[PDB]
Ligand binder design. Structure first.
Ligand SMILES: CNC(=O)c1cccc(-c2ccc(O[C@H]3O[C@H](CO)[C@@H](O)[C@H](O)[C@@H]3O)c(C)c2)c1
Length: 158
């Protein structure tokens, strides 16, 4: 089990860390959502699908910078949504193919009442998402740590 990103970096067997750089809607109103879809950013696969079933969770999702200060919301994982920043570990998604498969995580972030002006700065860390991978074969329990950075400013109109 290993993963790759849309910026040409990777995390090998056993886990580790990578940076992810996301383009963001440049304008988000109070009462609306900024959607940060990581399923176009992070992809993983199973290295022995004939024999091994890989299990993948979102173990933890943390907010940083402008997201931490200026937004609240939820994270959608494989069709179900949970509070973000996270308060538990999600259910498992199965990886059962050698073919790249997206990690089905998306953030739905809505501005807090006091947000206004530039609410997320270009280049800044906005989140850290921990993918936990286990399997039905051995005791492997690995963390794939994804540091999510904004490519651009996000403005919340006054
Ligand atoms: C055709 N293959 C073969 O004959 C063949 C023979 C002997 C061994 C393997 C093989 C390959 C990879 C293995 O572990 C890695 O991949 C797993 C699936 O993604 C993960 O669950 C693990 O955590 C880890 O990342 C493991 C444990 C075994 C394969």
């Amino acid at each position: 089990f290993a993963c790759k990103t849309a910026n040409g970096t990777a995390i090998p067997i056993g886990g580790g860390s990578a940076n992810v750089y996301v383009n963001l809607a440049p304008v988000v109103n109070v009462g609306q959502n900024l959607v940060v879809d990581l399923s176009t950013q992070i992809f993983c696969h199973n290295d022995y699908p004939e024999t091994i079933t890989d299990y993948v969770t979102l173990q933890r999702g943390s907010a940083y910078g402008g997201v931490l200060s200026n937004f609240s919301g939820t994270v959608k994982y494989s069709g179900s949504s949970y509070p973000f920043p996270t308060t538990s570990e999600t259910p498992r998604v199965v990886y059962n193919s050698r073919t790249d498969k997206p990690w089905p995580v998306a953030l739905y972030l809505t501005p807090v009442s006091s947000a206004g002006g530039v609410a997320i700065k270009a280049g800044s860390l906005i989140a850290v998402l921990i993918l936990r991978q286990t399997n039905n074969y051995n005791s492997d329990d690995f963390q794939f740590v994804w540091n999510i950075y904004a490519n651009n400013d996000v403005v919340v109109p006054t």
